[PDB]
Amino acid sequence: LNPKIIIFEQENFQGHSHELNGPCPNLKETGVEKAGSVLVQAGPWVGYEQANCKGEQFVFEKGEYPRWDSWTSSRRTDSLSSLRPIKVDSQEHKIILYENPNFTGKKMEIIDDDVPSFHAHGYQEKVSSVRVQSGTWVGYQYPGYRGLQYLLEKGDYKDSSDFGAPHPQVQSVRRIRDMQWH
Amino acid sequence: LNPKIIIFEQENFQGHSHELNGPCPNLKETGVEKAGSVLVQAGPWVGYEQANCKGEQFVFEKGEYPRWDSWTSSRRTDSLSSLRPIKVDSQEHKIILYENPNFTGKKMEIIDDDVPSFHAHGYQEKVSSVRVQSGTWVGYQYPGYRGLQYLLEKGDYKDSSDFGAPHPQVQSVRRIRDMQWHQRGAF
Amino acid sequence: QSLNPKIIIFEQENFQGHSHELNGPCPNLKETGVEKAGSVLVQAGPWVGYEQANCKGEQFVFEKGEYPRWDSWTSSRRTDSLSSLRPIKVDSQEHKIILYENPNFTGKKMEIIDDDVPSFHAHGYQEKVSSVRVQSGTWVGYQYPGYRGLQYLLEKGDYKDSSDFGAPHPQVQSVRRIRDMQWHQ
Amino acid sequence: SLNPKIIIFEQENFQGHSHELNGPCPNLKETGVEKAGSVLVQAGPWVGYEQANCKGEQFVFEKGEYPRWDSWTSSRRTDSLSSLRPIKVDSQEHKIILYENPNFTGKKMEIIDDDVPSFHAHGYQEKVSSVRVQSGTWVGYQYPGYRGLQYLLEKGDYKDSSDFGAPHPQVQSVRRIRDMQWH
């Protein structure tokens, strides 16, 4: 996707408006010097009181900033003069378990957390293929981490046999988050 | 809502079965004296190798246990002789924010976590009424906890003016989790 | 941590001048002797402040820390700045389990809050578990790491010895918390 | 740390001959291990296999005591364990360290993943003159509850308070930016 923010010259998103999809060192060249309202459609962004991204800063998040003092957190902060999108570094651990081989059918997506019961999460189907984007996981045949263990690491598993399962049945999954070396 | 567990005399949910919606001190009456498989539709439950909920214990959660050794890892466990539902103590911090007054219209559900942007959560509407089921929250007019603050505590807020907002607009909420003292007493 | 909240209002900014310690709710700071609210210093909170008396108007949440100026809690430069205060009765529930080395809740001890512990050895606890105290939550203790071995359902109460939670030998190496339930009484 | 550490014994309850392992072992009987009686994990986690060359049933060994074969498998086998290898765990974190004095000196505070609305409640009542961001995207604030001047803290080193935009070396609350709607 593309970062999207729109600054308005007046309050309550009125008057002239300018759309920004990248970094802006000087805002007077957009037709809006003293911004009155800001609509953030895809961010986040960081704004600065001076040109060329200097001075006091303020972070914009997705939402509506209808007033001139909405995004500031200190009264002595001057008007918006420069703005740029933030390249957020946020890592997560994701594993996707599919009902049919070759990553088709119904799927369940797990992010970071352990799932002791697949049935409680609304997934009562089989598990024939697994895609691990990140993290180290262990799958189990039965709820509560019972039954045969399946170490699931970063990679693709086109078939249940590819991660050691005789039949395509997985009902619980936990994540290994600790490591006493390296 | 009642708990639901089904026990079978044979593995893979075959043979005679018995459904339990409450505790059973002796599985001898249910016709399934040595359960071969167990189906947990609503739990969790805890099983016991002896009657009257004694001996080694096994925790059953929602799902399918198709073998008589599936709910345990020890090989010394005896057959299932009694079961009872677990009265789980799991607390969550819940706040509901509605679009129209009197708790109507589009609603947004927040549990435990902070939300710095209502728009990122799929809620781009106004906030005219609030229902706080549990927890201590602070609502804000603008994303990133900016603007006027509104202390949202346990109870109902039928109008925006009831939680201190003449303007029905909330875009970020954080939960107060820490507290450096303990209020003793009763009321 | 104390038995009462604690906040201090200073007449001037940066915690200078006359100070006024508050240990409870105050509906009107002015009539109590506070000439001005120059700065606010929270040592046992949190608190909520209000622009007007009777806890009305704009609200300011004060947490433990330093609020050295008016612009630290409000963007409007009013002469009142802060007219009332009261301690917040926070509703923050946690699930606490404490496992002791010796019976009757003595010896080495390890406390777990909310989260699951798949390995006691990785958490620094390599000793036996003879007594257990469940403050809140529903827990399952296992005798081996990775939630393997004999199971012990640990619920709200006290366990003086291993036999009280059905353990033949005081050995526990992993505990997980039960967080879901599909039936309501 | 540095190297993994598993120790496998011939008899149960960690009795008999002991063969230490600091890496992968395709075949346990060739390293002098007759029978896998008990397993003690001092630095892991490890993954064991019922057959050689890391094939067959899998057993996850975490730090702790595994005194009998019942602890990792329910099927009695003559050879309960044939191969062992350390797991290369993929576990990402977001750490930021804030130091009292410039150039990363004095008292310090580390924050992992979670937001901190009050440094005083966290046990840190000092100034913040230098910041080291090893991972994640953070916004530091002058006052508790994410108030006052904001400072965007990104991956890198800030040796002085002015390096992250603070003419006054004061930080009392930090939150992490977790979401992004582009790229």
XYZ file of C-alpha atoms in Angstrom, chain B:
187
model
C -25.095 -22.240 28.732
C -24.288 -25.641 30.226
C -21.036 -27.607 29.876
C -21.152 -30.513 27.446
C -18.893 -33.573 27.343
C -19.554 -36.895 25.596
C -17.760 -40.124 26.505
C -17.644 -43.262 24.361
C -16.811 -46.853 25.257
C -14.680 -47.377 22.128
C -12.002 -45.292 20.458
C -12.804 -42.907 17.590
C -16.210 -42.054 19.103
C -17.824 -45.427 18.400
C -20.001 -47.681 20.508
C -22.270 -46.685 23.363
C -22.012 -43.047 24.437
C -23.179 -40.855 27.303
C -23.553 -37.075 27.397
C -22.768 -35.222 30.632
C -24.015 -31.710 31.401
C -22.862 -31.778 35.030
C -20.485 -33.559 37.396
C -20.491 -37.356 37.544
C -18.931 -38.961 40.647
C -18.984 -42.508 39.206
C -18.937 -43.337 35.491
C -20.241 -46.848 36.246
C -23.854 -45.682 35.913
C -23.287 -44.110 32.480
C -22.588 -47.482 30.834
C -19.122 -46.247 29.814
C -16.968 -47.619 32.623
C -13.703 -47.468 30.620
C -13.957 -44.536 28.216
C -12.167 -45.101 24.920
C -12.747 -41.611 23.536
C -14.073 -38.268 24.779
C -15.703 -35.347 22.950
C -15.655 -31.955 24.687
C -18.254 -29.595 23.222
C -18.332 -27.094 26.111
C -15.777 -27.105 28.910
C -13.161 -27.289 30.187
C -13.545 -30.451 32.298
C -11.271 -32.353 34.673
C -11.249 -36.147 34.770
C -10.123 -38.470 37.543
C -8.871 -42.054 37.534
C -10.832 -42.851 40.719
C -14.450 -42.227 41.628
C -15.608 -39.180 43.613
C -12.965 -37.053 41.838
C -9.897 -38.671 43.415
C -6.605 -39.954 42.053
C -4.691 -38.705 39.038
C -6.346 -35.861 37.137
C -6.644 -34.992 33.449
C -7.839 -31.662 32.049
C -10.201 -31.836 29.065
C -10.590 -28.875 26.710
C -12.849 -28.297 23.719
C -11.917 -30.734 20.980
C -11.674 -34.422 20.153
C -9.894 -37.070 22.253
C -10.166 -40.174 20.040
C -7.999 -42.565 22.098
C -7.997 -43.702 25.720
C -4.376 -42.529 26.093
C -4.977 -39.196 24.339
C -5.848 -37.117 27.422
C -2.709 -38.160 29.333
C 1.038 -38.451 28.829
C 1.719 -40.905 31.667
C 1.280 -44.588 30.845
C 0.391 -45.562 34.438
C -2.992 -43.804 34.476
C -6.079 -45.935 35.066
C -9.427 -45.715 33.294
C -11.700 -42.699 33.641
C -13.986 -43.001 36.674
C -15.351 -39.491 37.333
C -15.688 -36.100 35.650
C -16.697 -32.575 36.628
C -16.785 -29.193 34.869
C -14.084 -26.677 35.736
C -15.302 -23.357 37.158
C -12.604 -21.296 35.461
C -11.551 -17.990 37.038
C -10.437 -15.952 34.011
C -10.858 -12.189 34.350
C -10.912 -9.821 31.383
C -11.181 -6.037 31.126
C -14.030 -5.101 28.786
C -15.252 -1.752 27.452
C -17.897 -1.243 24.757
C -18.150 2.001 22.771
C -21.288 2.663 20.721
C -21.920 5.071 17.857
C -25.366 6.360 18.865
C -26.609 7.274 22.357
C -28.387 4.726 24.554
C -25.957 1.979 23.462
C -27.184 1.569 19.876
C -25.669 1.667 16.408
C -22.238 0.445 15.396
C -20.165 -0.736 18.354
C -16.491 -1.390 19.049
C -15.190 -4.031 21.460
C -11.931 -3.559 23.386
C -10.587 -6.238 25.739
C -7.513 -5.694 27.949
C -5.317 -3.894 25.417
C -4.727 -0.258 24.553
C -5.910 1.001 21.173
C -4.046 4.098 19.906
C -6.267 4.454 16.812
C -9.969 3.672 16.468
C -9.695 4.059 12.684
C -7.011 1.359 12.514
C -9.358 -0.965 14.437
C -12.053 -0.526 11.773
C -14.132 2.016 13.737
C -14.393 5.405 12.005
C -17.702 6.453 13.597
C -18.566 8.752 16.483
C -18.792 7.623 20.117
C -22.011 8.742 21.816
C -22.340 6.105 24.559
C -19.959 3.859 26.495
C -20.432 0.609 28.426
C -17.589 -0.315 30.790
C -17.851 -3.946 31.880
C -14.527 -3.964 33.748
C -11.181 -2.220 33.984
C -10.088 1.405 34.211
C -9.812 3.260 30.902
C -8.974 6.735 29.623
C -10.585 7.790 26.358
C -9.176 10.502 24.114
C -10.599 12.676 21.350
C -7.784 12.079 18.856
C -5.494 9.160 17.938
C -2.381 8.546 19.980
C -3.982 9.585 23.295
C -4.216 13.252 22.301
C -6.892 15.790 23.149
C -9.309 15.851 26.052
C -9.091 12.883 28.421
C -12.139 10.968 29.676
C -11.790 8.633 32.661
C -14.032 5.673 31.767
C -14.863 3.545 34.816
C -17.217 0.652 35.548
C -20.805 1.575 34.733
C -22.976 2.872 31.899
C -22.670 6.131 29.954
C -25.888 6.671 27.999
C -24.699 9.984 26.505
C -21.401 11.572 25.526
C -21.956 14.208 28.227
C -22.156 11.426 30.833
C -18.437 10.615 30.533
C -17.469 14.284 30.259
C -17.491 14.844 26.482
C -19.738 17.569 25.023
C -18.440 16.325 21.648
C -19.180 12.651 20.841
C -15.710 11.803 19.514
C -13.313 9.160 20.847
C -10.395 7.854 18.788
C -7.981 6.253 21.281
C -8.332 4.388 24.579
C -5.708 3.083 26.999
C -6.174 0.914 30.081
C -4.873 1.917 33.505
C -3.166 -1.213 34.825
C -0.939 -0.013 37.689
C -1.874 1.329 41.119
C 0.497 2.060 44.006
C -1.952 1.544 46.887
C -4.832 -0.662 48.007
C -8.212 0.687 49.113
C -9.155 -1.365 52.166
C -12.627 -1.730 53.638
C -15.962 -2.523 51.997
C -17.671 0.643 50.740
